[PDB]
Amino acid sequence: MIVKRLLGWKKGEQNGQEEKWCEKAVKSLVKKLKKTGQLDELEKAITTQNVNTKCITIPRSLDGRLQVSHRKGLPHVIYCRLWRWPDLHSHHELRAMELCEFAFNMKKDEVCVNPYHYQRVETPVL
Amino acid sequence: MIVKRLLGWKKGEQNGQEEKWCEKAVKSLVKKLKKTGQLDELEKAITTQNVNTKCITIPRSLDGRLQVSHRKGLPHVIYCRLWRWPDLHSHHELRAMELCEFAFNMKKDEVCVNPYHYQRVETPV
DNA sequence: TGCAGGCGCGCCTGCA
DNA sequence: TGCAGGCGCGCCTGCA
Ligand SMILES: [Zn+2]
Ligand SMILES: [Zn+2]
């Protein structure tokens, strides 16, 4: 199973309840990418950490949030936290790479959730 | 024994040598907190993971490091790694909570080693 | 520069 | 209370 394989790349140490949620977050993404034929690209990006992979997109919601098992969050934040930065606190800490065509900030009909298309930046000035 | 009970809360999977070191690190802290009457507060913070605990302090050294059984480290890093984040890289990955009065960064005469007074952050950009 | 690690005096413990 | 021996904080050297 691709879900168990992708979960093997998950960052951080989660408790029982948190583990179950992360699994639902991976299952949710896997179901979407399977329908659009982008599943192999996610496997490639996650297992190899290759920045030069294609955008991995999902439809953007009206308010930008994604709900997974009764919890809402920004999808690029969810998947960047899951596979790269477990202590990432917000989207203000993320900036998309130059080659990202569907970066969250662009506010297109599709949002790129490829964690290797984002970089961490300094928290904005007050 | 408070040492055995606090060790039961240790994070990660340690080999024989590391287990013995972790025990010395808990024994070292327990001896200091007993002398300043803070042992019950450590027990409360560790066993209940309660952020709403008092600061748990030890005297700060000239260079900030603490030596336990021939190994030196920043004491808030040592105790946060032990009870919260076993892969904690450095003090650059820890920020103290707003209510921490003796946070390591404050460089006061006393340093807070309450792991629930710190939050783990990604390495500064 | 920060930071890691070698080394010893001073403090401590456990025997006399 | 003399004395032996363990260990850490402070001082130091050297590396990234
Ligand atoms: Zn992209
Ligand atoms: Zn504190």
Residue numbers in the entry:
A (entry chain B): 10 to 135
B (entry chain A): 10 to 134
Quote the study that presented this structure, word for word.
Smad proteins consist of an N-terminal MH1 domain, which binds to DNA, a linker region with phosphorylation sites for network regulatory inputs, and a C-terminal MH2 domain that is phosphorylated by the receptors and binds other Smad proteins, LDTFs, chromatin readers, and transcriptional co-activators and co-repressors. The receptors for TGF-β, nodal, activin, myostatin, and other family members are membrane serine/threonine kinases that phosphorylate and activate Smad2 and Smad3, whereas analogous receptors for the bone morphogenetic proteins (BMPs) preferentially phosphorylate and activate Smads 1, 5, and 8. These receptor-activated Smads (R-Smads) form heterotrimeric complexes with Smad4, which is required for the transcriptional regulation of most target genes. Focusing on the human and mouse Gsc promoter, here we identify specific Smad-binding GC-rich motifs and provide the X-ray crystal structures of Smad3 and Smad4 bound to several of these motifs. The structures determined here reveal that the β-hairpin is flexible and adaptable to bind with high-affinity several variants of the consensus sequence GGC(GC)|(CG), which we refer to as 5GC SBE.
